[PDB]
Scaffold this motif. Structure first.
Motif, mmCIF file in Angstrom:
data_model
loop_
_atom_site.group_PDB
_atom_site.id
_atom_site.type_symbol
_atom_site.label_atom_id
_atom_site.label_comp_id
_atom_site.label_asym_id
_atom_site.label_seq_id
_atom_site.Cartn_x
_atom_site.Cartn_y
_atom_site.Cartn_z
ATOM 1 N N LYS A 66 -20.018 -13.154 -20.458
ATOM 2 C CA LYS A 66 -19.419 -13.862 -21.637
ATOM 3 C C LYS A 66 -17.917 -14.121 -21.395
ATOM 4 O O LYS A 66 -17.263 -14.592 -22.351
ATOM 5 N N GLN A 67 -17.408 -13.921 -20.172
ATOM 6 C CA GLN A 67 -15.970 -14.023 -19.793
ATOM 7 C C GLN A 67 -15.786 -14.966 -18.596
ATOM 8 O O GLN A 67 -14.762 -15.660 -18.560
ATOM 9 N N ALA A 68 -16.720 -14.976 -17.640
ATOM 10 C CA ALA A 68 -16.537 -15.794 -16.416
ATOM 11 C C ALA A 68 -16.406 -17.276 -16.779
ATOM 12 O O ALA A 68 -17.102 -17.719 -17.701
ATOM 13 N N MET A 69 -15.532 -18.008 -16.079
ATOM 14 C CA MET A 69 -15.375 -19.469 -16.326
ATOM 15 C C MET A 69 -16.363 -20.230 -15.435
ATOM 16 O O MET A 69 -17.190 -19.572 -14.777
ATOM 17 N N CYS A 126 -28.912 -13.935 -20.415
ATOM 18 C CA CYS A 126 -27.765 -13.494 -19.605
ATOM 19 C C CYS A 126 -28.020 -12.150 -18.964
ATOM 20 O O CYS A 126 -27.177 -11.310 -19.049
ATOM 21 N N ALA A 127 -29.204 -11.942 -18.467
ATOM 22 C CA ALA A 127 -29.460 -10.747 -17.702
ATOM 23 C C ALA A 127 -30.524 -11.266 -16.811
ATOM 24 O O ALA A 127 -31.342 -10.519 -16.367
ATOM 25 N N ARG A 166 -24.364 -0.559 -16.297
ATOM 26 C CA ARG A 166 -23.620 -1.522 -15.441
ATOM 27 C C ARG A 166 -24.109 -2.948 -15.727
ATOM 28 O O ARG A 166 -23.257 -3.831 -15.848
ATOM 29 N N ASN A 167 -25.422 -3.152 -15.855
ATOM 30 C CA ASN A 167 -25.981 -4.489 -16.201
ATOM 31 C C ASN A 167 -25.507 -4.919 -17.598
ATOM 32 O O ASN A 167 -25.139 -6.111 -17.762
ATOM 33 N N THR A 168 -25.481 -3.995 -18.568
ATOM 34 C CA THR A 168 -24.939 -4.399 -19.899
ATOM 35 C C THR A 168 -23.470 -4.834 -19.762
ATOM 36 O O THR A 168 -23.063 -5.902 -20.350
ATOM 37 N N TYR A 169 -22.700 -4.080 -18.976
ATOM 38 C CA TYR A 169 -21.260 -4.393 -18.810
ATOM 39 C C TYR A 169 -21.141 -5.776 -18.172
ATOM 40 O O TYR A 169 -20.233 -6.512 -18.554
ATOM 41 N N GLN A 170 -22.007 -6.083 -17.202
ATOM 42 C CA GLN A 170 -21.979 -7.419 -16.550
ATOM 43 C C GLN A 170 -22.385 -8.552 -17.495
ATOM 44 O O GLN A 170 -21.866 -9.634 -17.314
ATOM 45 N N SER A 171 -23.357 -8.358 -18.382
ATOM 46 C CA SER A 171 -23.625 -9.450 -19.359
ATOM 47 C C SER A 171 -22.346 -9.653 -20.188
ATOM 48 O O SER A 171 -21.924 -10.846 -20.443
ATOM 49 N N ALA A 172 -21.690 -8.537 -20.536
ATOM 50 C CA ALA A 172 -20.411 -8.710 -21.263
ATOM 51 C C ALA A 172 -19.386 -9.478 -20.413
ATOM 52 O O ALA A 172 -18.686 -10.315 -20.995
ATOM 53 N N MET A 173 -19.285 -9.199 -19.107
ATOM 54 C CA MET A 173 -18.342 -9.896 -18.181
ATOM 55 C C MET A 173 -18.712 -11.376 -18.075
ATOM 56 O O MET A 173 -17.803 -12.190 -17.894
#
Ligand SMILES: [Zn+2]
Lengths: 196, 79, 209, 147, 87, 49, 753, 49
Positions: D45-48, D22-23, D36-43
């Motif tokens: 785990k949220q996107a449908m 996931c990166a 910012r890339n770490t925050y996006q891998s976290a996001m």
């Protein structure tokens, strides 16, 4: 209005108003942007990869091919992707000339527009929203509980029980703490303080 | 008597009074200055404070135990 | 060094005198200002193998206001302290008939002796200051505000203006270094006057317990 | 050349395989800030997006499909490996980095009412509820009936 | 020890009743010296003879929607004492 | 430093299922290899240093 | 709304177009980077060849770092300068920074210049793989790019090696965001219990619940901190010559008076001495004032947070009354002098006629009043502001309205408000102040202050050298070591216990030459000589700094165990300074050899060659900053800073440290609260804690008005003993059972109650 | 999670392709939950005879 949407480069943002195609900035060939992310967010956080993929996606869309952005490709300096975009006829660096939708007058500064992948996060306002008023109460401790509709309210915990003392507002504190959660009147004997 | 307390009203006595006067007006109490196109108890009562005319006297208990009792008219409107 | 002992002794004594001038005991400015070389001239080159005797540094002075009450500083020549030696001083004081006196214990004292100082609880009150402590005048250090003391009469007036029972007043314990230096006792108010930035001088009166 | 070294024993297959599942959905990760890339891998785990292709028979609680998942126009070369042109998680949007009426400040996106009306991001929120008939009572039966 | 105090001048467990009796003889003035205030507190008052049972409210009965009336747990403690006390 | 006898910088070994720490030479001897020379070569292989 | 409409007719948008730069700048930046690679390579060869010198008070490895970090830090900045210079007046990135809404000058640099050096734990990415930083590099590689410098800019993109490094560098920030998150409410939640109910009760005595007086008048001034703004005092800093020149109202020039004032006043000012006397007394009062202020604010800051801002008010008045500054005055200078007094009588923090209540008002407003007298002074009003009579009246009236209104409101919960106000920055400060020896600051240090735990990460006492010694490091250095604890291990070169049955046995001849001199007068050798004896060698390089003398070593070694140890010094000139020490000759006259081994260890450890034992390290830095320079009022009447050596030392033993000669015992203080209480008393602790909190909320650049600082530092030191105010420290309290049922012992306290 | 020091969470240099550096959760689990890189392959286990 409220649902989180986020790009692939670390920028996460809820919607603030939605507007119809007619009252939105329009390109001179008719292309109204479906999302208008704020310029201020990019600087302090430096995601200068979201803006490069914005350029490459435009190059890819006009050339009809999925554009590769492997972490290190060497064939993608910002300049090389830009010169391809220039042939198609846009500002080599992505900017396009937009016009205010409500008035029609050309927005002086040339807005940077382009295609960028957007992922719609699962979190939604409907799940988050909670509201309470004269709501179901637990009989054993008579302090608010939860029934249908998420009627379990928020909690005045000690931290926010203390800004109220600082503001000096006693009556709100008395109201939030007693009247709002557990108002009872009990008849007490005067000579002895036992209940009556 | 010897008032030792400050002449000016305190930031918080202009709040409990504006509110107290207001529960009176809403409950049908007589009013003490002209009210024009105004039906809101706080606006009717914030107006009275502007004129120094509300019927209330403030018992400022001193730290030791004695109740000095200044009155709305004497207290200088701080706002 | 023996010369160091002279240097140290001169200083110990020098500050000791100031304490009395401040405490209100009568002292000549000349004595406070006695310079170390003068000290050497007055008492000798060295206590060890020299004129200073570890004794004679001892002195008796009375309040500038009142000659009747006198305080005798005793620098025990013996580095360690024996109660009998104090008892000898006590007898010397019994003759002097002046209650106030101080002992510059050089290093350590018998625990019994300390209780024995308490044993003469109201008789010839005496106080012990470790030699090391007297070396530096705490009252001139930057963080130490200029403590001053008040008569019982002033205390009554203070209570009246603020209508304060004495227990409510802020409290300063007697054992603290400043109190001993001003010779404080329980129940006595020492005002503290200090410069503070927002205003100028705020004078906070603290009672002791 | 003036080699840093001449004894290299082993050389790496492609350096962009040091990033996980996931990166590798993120293009130009080095260009972006690392947090910012770490925050996006976290996001992520949220996107449908479409969860698996048997959504119709599976019946888990809380599962949201999306009306039109679209493969990204800019693609990291190694996305294909993780089945992403088969299960995409979002739609390419004509986005435009600009300040308009103000409602876009502080991480807020303005959006076109007309486009969210032609299907852009429409989704279904399936939520399964199960009730079990209990015969725990000696005489107490939780039978199934129209009360 | 745990629940019982045994006194040796001759070493016997101390009767609650006897200790209660001693406190009954206790002087009010001596209790004031003890620091207890007699008007609201007496050493004799300390020993328990009657168990206050809290009202039905502090021990509510949870009927779980018509299954039946699960008794509140505290009721159970009161119940055992009653069965044993009666016997 | 405390005491720990005249000896200092002593190698000491806690072991499984014991009570108090055991001096190392002892454990080696107990396993065996009583000869103090045997213990030494089993640890320090070269006596030159 | 209006500026949002302007953004609609103009717009702002940041684009790749703003992150690209002109080829001159793209190449100009490369040349600066190439130099770094060249210069760093010079440092490596110089050290690789051992040529590189060691540096004062630093290890060689640290020197390499101090030198390399210098060359890299300039490179980020110099490539930084060229980059910002190129951006035009349309670059979008620049407009956002200049507005200050978003972005930083360093941010612009990282997106068009050189991402700069990446680091972990305040060092360079460390060798984790044995002698390497990632597999690709060869071992023992000190190259700047390999160690951590990410030369490539964000727009260029990071090579894979540097991408990893950048991530490591970010990880610590994401590790901090979690350490910051937990301490968010920790401090205030504990403090509020201690400052739970301090209020400004109706007579202004800030008092706690029992009604005890924590602060006699709020904040010592009675002004609540909302209406107070920073003003320049204006009299403390100026030179004596100036003080007369600026304020005086000379009645001598006449022509000057002619231009400045209306004639009617002009003749009279010349005519009446009584008018003139007021002026001279007036300046005189101010002369007296400067003197008081000079002590009240010793260092030289002129910024105060006093109430109504006289300067703006004069200006406002100038506009409302339309004074024209080029023409003569109408205000009788004397009106001003009486007028100021009239304002002064009216503004009252305290209102009691009797002395004890008249002394206090003077004390409380001394600063504001001195300001009113300096700013409204007539010479100045007549010259600098040139106000007119109708206007002076609005001004006096206005100053009084603001001052009288600034008094705090009775019934304010000043206590609860103060605790939360201090907490906000407590969260803002860094996790441990390793970087900005080590200083501990942030919520960890603020904790040491909240609950008084003596142990600190850095117990330290600054030392201010008394005088002549500081000017010259030579005297300073000896004193610096004089305090430092030193023992045999530090100066020891080698130890030995060879067997020598007789003195003339002399197993080593070099000892024999002076052994013969000892043997020349072998006093007590007749009792015996150790059959086996200890010989001790030391190195002068260590000895020289100590300026140690063997005789000193000898007398002290003799002075301790006793004649049981006998030694004769080696010749000092002899390079092999050695001490041959053997057990008592009468003792020779339990095995001695074994006894000696123990003796050697104890001797080596407790030599206490010189200095107080606890302090272990002394570093000496002359202070370039104005923070501690001795500031003296000069003869002409000026504040100037004198650069004097200050010795910062670890450990705390104020009594002896202060005791030592040449340690100014006036300005030398611990960084630790417990020590201050034991040797200077509770009142010093109260002034000291304020300094300790102020240091902490100065590193941020943050400000907290003193009002909040004093109350936390007075409520804590109130009952007379420093009180820990963590939940445990005030857990013991004078409270009703319901209040003491507030903390987990609710069942137990009540049964007892 | 709450050992006061944060030694393990800091990315050690030995995670070159062993773990994905970018993927770290934010919260009480920071840097204590890591995800594998695409090409790692943990050993299954063999007999060394
Ligand atoms: Zn009754």
């Amino acid at each position: 209005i409220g649902d989180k949407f986020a790009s692939r480069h670390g920028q996460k943002g809820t919607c603030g108003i939605q507007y119809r195609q007619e009252d939105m900035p329009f390109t001179c060939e008719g292309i109204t942007p479906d999302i208008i992310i704020n310029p201020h967010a990019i600087p302090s956080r430096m995601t200068i990869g979201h803006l490069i993929e914005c350029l490459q996606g435009k190059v890819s869309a006009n050339k009809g091919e999925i554009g590769d952005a492997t972490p290190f490709n060497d064939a993608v300096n910002v300049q090389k992707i830009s010169n391809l975009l220039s042939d198609y006829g846009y500002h080599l660096r992505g900017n396009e000339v937009l016009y205010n939708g409500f008035t029609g007058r050309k927005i002086t500064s040339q807005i940077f527009i382009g295609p960028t992948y957007y992922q719609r996060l699962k979190h939604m306002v409907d799940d988050k929203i909670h509201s309470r008023a004269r709501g179901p109460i637990q009989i054993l401790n008579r302090q608010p509980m939860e029934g249908r509709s998420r009627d379990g309210g928020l909690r005045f915990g000690e931290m926010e029980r203390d800004c109220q003392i600082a503001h000096g507002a006693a009556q709100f504190l008395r109201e939030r703490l007693f009247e709002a959660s557990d108002p009872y009147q009990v008849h007490v004997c005067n000579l002895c303080g036992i209940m009556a | 008597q010897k008032r030792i307390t400050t002449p000016y009203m305190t930031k918080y006595e202009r709040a409990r009074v504006l509110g107290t006067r207001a529960l009176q007006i809403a409950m049908c109490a007589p009013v003490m200055v002209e009210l024009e196109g105004e039906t809101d108890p706080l606006l009717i009562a914030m107006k009275e404070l502007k004129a120094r005319k509300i019927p209330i006297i403030i018992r400022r208990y001193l730290p030791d135990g004695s109740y000095e009792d200044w009155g709305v008219d004497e207290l200088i409107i701080s706002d | 060094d023996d010369e160091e002992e002279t240097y140290r002794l001169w200083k110990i004594r020098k500050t000791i005198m100031q304490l009395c001038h401040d405490r209100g005991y009568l002292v000549t400015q000349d004595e406070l200002d006695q310079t170390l070389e003068e000290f050497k001239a007055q008492f000798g080159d060295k206590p060890s193998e020299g004129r200073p005797r570890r004794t004679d540094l001892t002195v008796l002075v009375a309040h500038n206001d009142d000659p009747t009450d006198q305080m005798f500083v005793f620098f025990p020549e013996e580095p360690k302290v024996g109660i009998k030696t104090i008892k000898v001083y006590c007898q010397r004081m019994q003759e002097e008939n002046i209650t106030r006196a101080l002992i510059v214990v050089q290093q350590g004292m018998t625990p019994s002796a300390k209780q024995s100082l308490v044993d003469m609880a109201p008789k010839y009150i005496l106080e012990q200051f470790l030699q090391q402590e007297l070396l530096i005048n705490i009252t001139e250090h930057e963080l130490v505000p200029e403590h001053v003391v008040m008569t019982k009469e002033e205390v009554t007036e203070l209570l009246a203006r603020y209508k304060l029972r004495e227990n409510q007043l802020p409290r300063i314990q007697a054992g603290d270094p400043v109190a001993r230096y001003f010779g404080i006792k329980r129940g006595q108010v020492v005002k503290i006057i200090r410069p503070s930035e927002t205003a100028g001088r705020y004078i906070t009166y603290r009672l002791v317990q | 050349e003036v080699a840093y070294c001449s004894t290299y024993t082993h050389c790496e297959i492609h350096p962009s395989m040091i990033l996980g599942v996931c990166a590798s959905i993120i293009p130009f990760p080095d260009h972006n800030q690392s947090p910012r890339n770490t925050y996006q891998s976290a996001m992520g785990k949220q996107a449908m997006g479409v969860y698996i292709t048997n959504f119709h028979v599976r019946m888990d609680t809380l599962a949201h499909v999306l009306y039109y998942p679209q493969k990204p126009l800019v693609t990291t070369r190694s996305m294909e490996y993780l089945r992403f042109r088969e299960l995409p998680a979002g739609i390419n949007s004509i986005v435009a980095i600009a300040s308009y009426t103000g409602y876009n400040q502080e991480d807020s996106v303005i959006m076109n009412r007309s486009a969210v009306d032609r299907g852009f991001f429409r989704s279904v929120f399936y939520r399964s509820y199960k009730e079990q008939e209990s015969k725990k009572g000696f005489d107490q039966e939780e039978v199934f009936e129209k009360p | 020890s745990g629940l019982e105090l045994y006194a040796e001048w001759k070493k016997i467990l101390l009767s609650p009743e006897r200790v209660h009796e001693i406190f009954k003889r206790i002087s009010d003035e001596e209790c004031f010296v003890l620091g207890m205030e007699p008007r609201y507190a007496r050493p004799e008052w300390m020993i328990v003879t009657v168990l206050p049972v809290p009202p039905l409210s502090v021990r509510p009965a949870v009927v779980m929607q018509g299954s039946a009336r699960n008794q509140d747990d505290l009721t159970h403690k009161l119940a055992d004492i009653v069965k044993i006390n009666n016997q | 430093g405390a005491k720990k006898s005249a000896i200092g910088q002593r190698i000491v070994a806690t072991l499984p299922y014991i009570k108090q720490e055991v001096p190392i030479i002892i454990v080696f001897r107990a396993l065996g290899f009583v000869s103090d020379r045997d213990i030494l070569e089993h640890i320090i292989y070269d006596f030159e240093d | 709304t209006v500026i949002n409409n302007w953004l609609l007719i103009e717009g702002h948008t940041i684009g790749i177009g703003d992150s690209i730069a002109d080829s001159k700048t793209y190449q100009d930046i490369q040349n600066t980077i190439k130099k770094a690679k060249q210069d760093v390579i010079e440092v490596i060869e110089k050290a690789h060849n051992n040529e590189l010198e060691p540096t004062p008070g630093n290890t060689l490895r640290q020197t390499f770092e101090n030198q390399v970090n210098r060359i890299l830090n300039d490179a980020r900045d110099k490539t930084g300068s060229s980059a910002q210079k190129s951006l035009s007046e349309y670059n979008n990135f620049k407009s956002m920074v200049v507005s200050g809404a978003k972005g930083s000058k360093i941010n612009i640099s990282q997106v068009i210049a050189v991402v700069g050096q990446q680091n972990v734990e305040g060092k360079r990415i460390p060798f984790g793989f044995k002698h390497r930083t990632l597999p690709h590099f060869i071992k023992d590689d000190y190259g700047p790019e390999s160690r951590g410098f990410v030369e490539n800019s964000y727009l260029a993109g990071l090579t894979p090696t540097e991408f990893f490094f950048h991530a490591m560098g970010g990880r610590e920030g994401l590790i901090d965001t979690a350490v910051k998150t937990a301490e968010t409410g920790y401090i205030q939640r504990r403090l509020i219990k201690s400052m739970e109910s301090v209020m400004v009760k109706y007579d202004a005595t800030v008092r706690n619940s029992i009604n005890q007086v924590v602060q006699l008048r709020y904040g010592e001034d009675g002004l609540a901190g909302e209406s107070v703004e920073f003003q320049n005092l204006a009299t403390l800093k100026p030179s004596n010559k100036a003080f007369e020149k600026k304020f005086r109202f000379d009645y001598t020039n006449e022509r000057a008076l002619r231009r400045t004032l209306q004639e009617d006043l002009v003749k009279d000012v010349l005519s009446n001495a009584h008018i003139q006397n007021e002026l001279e007394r007036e300046f005189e009062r101010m002369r007296e004032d400067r003197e008081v202020l000079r002590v009240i604010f010793p260092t030289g800051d002129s910024k105060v947070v006093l109430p109504c801002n006289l300067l703006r008010m004069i200006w406002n008045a100038q506009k409302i009354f339309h004074i024209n500054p080029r023409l003569p005055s109408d205000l009788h200078p004397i009106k001003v002098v009486e007028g100021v007094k009239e304002l002064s009588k009216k503004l009252v923090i305290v209102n009691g006629d009797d002395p004890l209540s008249r002394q206090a008002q003077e004390n409380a407003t001394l600063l504001f009043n001195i300001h009113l007298r300096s700013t409204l002074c007539s010479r100045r009003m007549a010259e600098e502001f040139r106000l007119s009579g109708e206007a002076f009246d609005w001004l006096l009236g206005e100053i009084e309205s603001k001052f009288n209104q600034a008094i705090a409101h009775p019934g304010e919960m000043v206590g609860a408000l103060a605790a939360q106000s201090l907490g906000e920055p407590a969260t803002q400060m860094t996790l441990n102040t390793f970087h900005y020896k080590n200083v501990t600051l942030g919520v960890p240090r603020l904790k040491e202050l909240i609950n008084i735990s003596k142990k600190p990460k850095t117990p330290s006492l600054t030392v201010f050298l008394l005088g002549q010694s500081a000017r010259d490091a030579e005297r300073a250095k000896d004193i610096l070591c004089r305090l430092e604890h030193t023992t045999l291990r530090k100066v020891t070169a080698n130890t030995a216990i060879y067997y020598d049955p007789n003195p003339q046995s002399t197993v080593v001849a070099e000892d024999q030459e002076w052994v013969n001199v000892y043997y020349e007068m072998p006093d007590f050798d007749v009792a015996r000589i150790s059959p086996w004896l200890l010989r001790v060698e030391l190195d002068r390089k260590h000895m020289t700094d100590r300026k140690l003398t063997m005789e000193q070593i000898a007398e002290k070694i003799n002075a301790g165990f006793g004649d049981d140890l006998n030694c004769i010094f080696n010749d000092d000139n002899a390079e092999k300074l050695v001490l041959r020490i053997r057990i008592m000759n009468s003792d020779e006259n339990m095995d001695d050899d074994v006894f000696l081994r123990c003796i050697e260890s104890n001797m080596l450890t407790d030599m206490t060659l010189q200095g107080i034992e606890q302090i272990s390290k002394v570093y000496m830095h002359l202070p370039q900053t104005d923070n501690k320079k001795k500031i003296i009022i000069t003869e002409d009447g000026e504040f100037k800073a004198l650069q004097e050596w200050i010795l910062e030392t670890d450990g705390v033993s104020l009594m002896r440290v202060l005791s030592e000669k040449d340690v100014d015992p006036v300005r030398t203080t611990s960084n630790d609260i417990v020590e201050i209480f034991t040797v200077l008393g509770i009142e010093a602790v109260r002034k000291a804690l304020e300094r300790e909190l102020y240091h902490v909320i100065s590193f941020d650049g943050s400000y907290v008005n003193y009002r909040h600082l004093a109350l936390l530092c007075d409520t804590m030191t109130c009952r007379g003993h420093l009180m820990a105010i963590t939940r445990h420290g005030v857990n013991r309290q004078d409270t009703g059972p319901l209040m003491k049922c507030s903390f987990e012992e609710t069942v137990d306290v009540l049964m007892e109650a | 999670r709450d050992g006061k020091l944060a030694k393990p969470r800091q990315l050690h240099n030995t995670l070159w392709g062993m773990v994905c550096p970018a993927e770290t959760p934010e919260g009480h689990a920071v840097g204590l939950v890591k995800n594998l890189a695409l090409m790692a392959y943990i050993s299954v286990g063999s007999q060394p005879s």
